[PDB]
Amino acid sequence: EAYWNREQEKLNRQYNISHLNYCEPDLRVTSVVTGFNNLPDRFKDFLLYLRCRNYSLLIDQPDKCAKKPFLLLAIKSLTPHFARRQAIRESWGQESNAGNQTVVRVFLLGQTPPEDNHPDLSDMLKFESEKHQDILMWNYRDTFFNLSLKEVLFLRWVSTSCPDTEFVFKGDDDVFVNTHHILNYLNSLSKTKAKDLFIGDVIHNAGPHRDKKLKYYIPEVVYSGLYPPYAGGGGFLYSGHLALRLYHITDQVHLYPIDDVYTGMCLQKLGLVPEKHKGFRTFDIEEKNKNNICSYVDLMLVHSRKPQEMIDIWSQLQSAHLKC
Amino acid sequence: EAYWNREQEKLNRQYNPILSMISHLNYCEPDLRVTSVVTGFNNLPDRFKDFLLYLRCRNYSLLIDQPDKCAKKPFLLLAIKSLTPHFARRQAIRESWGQESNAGNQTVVRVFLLGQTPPEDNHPDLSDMLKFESEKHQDILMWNYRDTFFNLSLKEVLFLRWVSTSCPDTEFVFKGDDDVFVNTHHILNYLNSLSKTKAKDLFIGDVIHNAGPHRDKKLKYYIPEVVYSGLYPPYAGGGGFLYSGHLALRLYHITDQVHLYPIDDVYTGMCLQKLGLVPEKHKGFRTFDIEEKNKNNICSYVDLMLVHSRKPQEMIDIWSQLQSAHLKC
Amino acid sequence: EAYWNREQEKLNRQYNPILSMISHLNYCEPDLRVTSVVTGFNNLPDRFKDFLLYLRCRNYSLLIDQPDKCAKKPFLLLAIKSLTPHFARRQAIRESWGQESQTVVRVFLLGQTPPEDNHPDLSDMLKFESEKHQDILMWNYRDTFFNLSLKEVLFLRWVSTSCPDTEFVFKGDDDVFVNTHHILNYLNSLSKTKAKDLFIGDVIHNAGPHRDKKLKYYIPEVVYSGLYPPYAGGGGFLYSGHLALRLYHITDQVHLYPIDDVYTGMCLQKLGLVPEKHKGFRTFDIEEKNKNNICSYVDLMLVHSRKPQEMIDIWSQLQSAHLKC
Ligand SMILES: *[C@@H]1O[C@H](CO)[C@@H](O[C@@H]2O[C@H](CO)[C@@H](O[C@@H]3O[C@H](CO)[C@@H](O)[C@H](O[C@H]4O[C@H](CO)[C@@H](O)[C@H](O)[C@@H]4O[C@H]4O[C@H](CO)[C@@H](O)[C@H](O)[C@@H]4O)[C@@H]3O)[C@H](O)[C@H]2NC(C)=O)[C@H](O)[C@H]1NC(C)=O
Ligand SMILES: *[C@@H]1O[C@H](CO)[C@@H](O[C@@H]2O[C@H](CO)[C@@H](O[C@@H]3O[C@H](CO)[C@@H](O)[C@H](O[C@H]4O[C@H](CO)[C@@H](O)[C@H](O)[C@@H]4O)[C@@H]3O)[C@H](O)[C@H]2NC(C)=O)[C@H](O)[C@H]1NC(C)=O
Ligand SMILES: *[C@@H]1O[C@H](CO)[C@@H](O[C@@H]2O[C@H](CO)[C@@H](O[C@@H]3O[C@H](CO)[C@@H](O)[C@H](O)[C@@H]3O)[C@H](O)[C@H]2NC(C)=O)[C@H](O)[C@H]1NC(C)=O
Ligand SMILES: C[C@@H](n1c(=O)[nH]c2ccc(C3=NC(=O)[C@](C)(c4ccccc4)N3)cc21)C(C)(C)C
Ligand SMILES: C[C@@H](n1c(=O)[nH]c2ccc(C3=NC(=O)[C@](C)(c4ccccc4)N3)cc21)C(C)(C)C
Ligand SMILES: C[C@@H](n1c(=O)[nH]c2ccc(C3=NC(=O)[C@](C)(c4ccccc4)N3)cc21)C(C)(C)C
Ligand SMILES: *[C@@H]1O[C@H](CO)[C@@H](O[C@@H]2O[C@H](CO)[C@@H](O)[C@H](O)[C@H]2NC(C)=O)[C@H](O)[C@H]1NC(C)=O
Ligand SMILES: *[C@@H]1O[C@H](CO)[C@@H](O)[C@H](O)[C@H]1NC(C)=O
Ligand SMILES: [Mn+2]
Ligand SMILES: [Mn+2]
Ligand SMILES: [Mn+2]
């Protein structure tokens, strides 16, 4: 009865009109979806062009994985977030080579076109791309409900341009990440748990928010029932082996407005469950402990932090072992 | 969990551009790891043991060839499966419905498909008579593999290879058993009534949907659960099917991506499914005999394409009566 | 007793090997004997007088020709009957369903609208249109309703000499909308045998001449007696290029008839063939309620009739009709 659930099981019995590169507006949804013309315009645009995901790469760094990476940092960002990206470049997103355990960094961007009243910062983006060589940008509209598109297109770039990275971190450009804690965690892993790695702040048996004022509002007419297990809150860590299997399976899952929920549907179709790890505190530390750098040593991700805070915490963290 | 299903999905991952990050085609030594992973292997019948141990070998060569069989482009290539000692079945087909012709644009050619019946399996050495029969009629194709029941999908793959290298321009292909009567006249009339689009992906026969593997150990099509699990794809079986040369060239290309299966007609269905096509049922394919009440009326043979099964004498008799059934019926 | 039947039976005896024991094709003086052997000649309408007086003439020349229009072997020859002042009709077809693209060619079939019949001189305009689109065929005869069967014959001649290789031929009016997409799907859905003797359209059986003097298809009894053969009329029909030459060769054996579509039926009947009815040929229109719904068009092949702007409109409402039907 809900549109996405109705169309997903239709897609499923196919694998037991194209849904991948039919890029004209499907207008059948206007009469099929109850109350279409009253929904917010993001639902309208999401349902009209759900069946198009063959968008091209505008800005690429094809040599980013010329040397085999051990951990690929892939940070979701928007065009005007220059300070966020530069803070990450200087703090936890530094590229390293501490023993051929190469850590590489890319930012994942869509477009902020002039027709959506975005200011033209494209000439500034290219200068940033030339100088830091860490920008990947595709020609889709970088909107909130196009973030699963951002997920799939990044998975495609890994299959073509970085298929041999050992591990992959994917997060938001406003989360602080303890990369030192992540590296030692990865190094401490058996090669059977490393193969199917997917950890984060996992939530089980969650349903869609129906309050039309909240961020993740999904009406019953669009989706029905409960969400599969999914890591959320702005960061999860998984294997490059799982990343390749993930991208292959995206063909059999329709896009979903919530990107972290879409990634849980792909893991489920693969017969896996994301593993909860307490180190992903997508809800912040208590204000009492924010002044104690030692409250950061044993976590892996804390949301959210401003560009100044990320540089400050990273600087204090470098000499934290002498105080904790 | 079954062995064939497990190995075929391994092959799907090998050919998938994303998921792919010894040969299954020319590894002709015994594949001994099947003795460990196939539960109850050494208790399986001999044909199952030999099928699993050499499943990865299909690069067999022609010992007898008719390389100029399709010099003139044929409208209908008749490809009849046969065994070496079936001299009477083949000769009866030559004199009856398997006659070659050049009737005004519509050329019909004929080949018999043979494997080996070697002396080490106690077969009588009939190679001299076979070479004599080949030189006389020039319609025998023979490959250097053991012609057993569980190697018929090998006979299927090797014939498609021969079509792609020696008869690619044939408009249509009929493949059948050497004991089925085929109304070639009715088949030609049906082929000529086809729209240009229906003739490109033509594949008709006696098709069965949602069929499963026979689990009785004593029947002819027995397949245990250690070998195959689940249901069969749709496939035409029971004596013969009809399809286009365009389809045959597509079929041979896809054969590399499908592991051999002990039932040849099932294997062809697996290839069709992988190609995205579905074989179409045609009621003229009587893989069971005609009703006993009508098995004597020559009328019953004007309106079918194929009937199973007829002895060599019966084929000649029915065909002779067909040459005048237009006035009687 | 009737004139055309009596004269047709004379032709049938002359063309029979056995029964054979002025011309009827290039006698272009007034056949004055019809004034006495046709009872009531003086009181017939003027179109019947001119038809009876020059029935035995048909060696008219090509004033404007596109000689290499079929230099590339066409899959479909679009032949449209049109009158010289119909510039809007022809250009609307050129931009819509008559687009020359399985290569498709297009020709418009015209006679002469001479000044002696009080026609405005549009010759300079026609030559400009012909020089710019290269799709005008015009013969030196009076383009009259009762001369349309003569239009059929001269076009069939032109096919046999200037475009004999065409696979299929469509012949229609310049005011009918034709779904070029749909009809091409029908043509590719044909076996060769059926594609060799194809002749489809709105076929009528056991039709007769209308005898009411004030109707358009009025034919008096002194001209034609009996019923009509099966014939396809009402806007257009589709047939094979092989059938076209079989049609031209035997037009010599059939006297011209005032009703062009009936004449083609007589030509087919003398060939031993029967035209095949096809419900996709809606010579009558479609129900007003089902109009505006573009799906009522992508199912049919021919609809009569539409104005120039409508043809351009429906053709563009068609290129997006698969989204909904
Ligand atoms: C995810 O990203 C994809 C790809 O970027 C997005 O899909 C694109 O979506 C846009 C809509 O935002 C769509 O644009 C429409 O194409 C239609 C084709 O007919 C047009 O109807 C429509 O034209 C409107 O916008 C034009 C430019 O603004 C105007 O020139 C035109 O007059 C129309 O104007 C309407 O909207 C403007 C708003 O500015 C308004 O001022 C006007 O009054 C009028 O109401 C669009 O051009 C693209 O076709 C899609 N691209 C592809 C490749 O498919 C998708 O929207 C994103 N998903 C989410 C959930 O955001
Ligand atoms: C389908 O056809 C293929 C090819 O014809 C066929 O594979 C062949 O199978 C036979 C077994 O029937 C293999 O022959 C054996 O190889 C092993 C190891 O080399 C030997 O142990 C066997 O020798 C035995 O038989 C000898 C008698 O000749 C005795 O001297 C000895 O004591 C043993 O009993 C035998 O040489 C052969 O290697 C393959 N050939 C190829 C090219 O792969 C397959 O069996 C057929 N499948 C079915 C299902 O029938
Ligand atoms: C069909 O087309 C033919 C060819 O145009 C028409 O024949 C033409 O008919 C006109 C009569 O309208 C003839 O003009 C006349 O000749 C007579 C005697 O010479 C004269 O008295 C008239 O003043 C006029 O000049 C013309 O000769 C004739 N053309 C030829 C070459 O035959 C015919 O009329 C048309 N038929 C119909 C049914 O409209
Ligand atoms: C999440 C990453 N992100 C991205 O990569 N593209 C985004 C596009 C939109 C947003 C986005 N979040 C919102 O609260 C807001 C304002 C929104 C508007 C309307 C309804 C719901 C939500 N819009 C975030 C994007 C980020 C922020 C880390 C870069
Ligand atoms: C079918 C065509 N055929 C062929 O071309 N090679 C064949 C090899 C074996 C057989 C074959 N059928 C059987 O019932 C039997 C006895 C069998 C033995 C063991 C298990 C199951 C079945 N063996 C048939 C072959 C034919 C007969 C028309 C030529
Ligand atoms: C039909 C095609 N047509 C053609 O090609 N030449 C024509 C010459 C005359 C006519 C024509 N229609 C008539 O109803 C009319 C006025 C007539 C008057 C008196 C009695 C009977 C008929 N005369 C049509 C011609 C057309 C129009 C699609 C191009
Ligand atoms: C198919 O090809 C394979 C390899 O291309 C052949 O395997 C060889 O078999 C010969 C037989 O004497 C051995 O000497 C070689 O050592 C084998 N090579 C390999 C690479 O395995 C096989 O013979 C062919 N199958 C046939 C011809 O039936
Ligand atoms: C995707 O492919 C389709 C058809 O191949 C094409 O129409 C479309 O332009 C492509 N998508 C984009 C966003 O260009
Ligand atoms: Mn956030
Ligand atoms: Mn049999
Ligand atoms: Mn009209």
From Swiss-Prot, chain A:
Predominant location: Golgi
MF-aspect GO terms: N-acetyl-beta-D-glucosaminide beta-(1,3)-galactosyltransferase activity; N-acetyllactosaminide beta-1,3-N-acetylglucosaminyltransferase activity
UniProt function note: Beta-1,3-N-acetylglucosaminyltransferase involved in the synthesis of poly-N-acetyllactosamine. Catalyzes the initiation and elongation of poly-N-acetyllactosamine chains. Shows a marked preference for Gal(beta1-4)Glc(NAc)-based acceptors. Probably constitutes the main polylactosamine synthase.
Cofactors that this protein relies on: Mn(2+)
UniProt pathway: Protein modification; protein glycosylation
Catalytically driven reaction(s): a beta-D-galactosyl-(1->4)-N-acetyl-beta-D-glucosaminyl derivative + UDP-N-acetyl-alpha-D-glucosamine = an N-acetyl-beta-D-glucosaminyl-(1->3)-beta-D-galactosyl-(1->4)-N-acetyl-beta-D-glucosaminyl derivative + UDP + H(+)
Keyword Membrane: yes
The protein's assembly and partners: Interacts with B3GNT8; this interaction greatly increases B3GNT2 catalytic activity, independently of B3GNT8 enzymatic activity.
Name of the protein described by the UniProt record: N-acetyllactosaminide beta-1,3-N-acetylglucosaminyltransferase 2
A biological-process GO annotation: sensory perception of smell
The organism's taxonomic lineage, starting at the top: Eukaryota, Metazoa, Chordata, Craniata, Vertebrata
Enzyme superclass (EC): transferase
Pfam families: Galactosyl_T
Keyword set, alphabetical order: Glycoprotein, Glycosyltransferase, Golgi apparatus, Manganese, Membrane, Signal-anchor, Transferase, Transmembrane, Transmembrane helix
Regions of this protein lying in the Lumenal compartment: 1-324
Family: Belongs to the glycosyltransferase 31 family.
GO cellular component: Golgi membrane
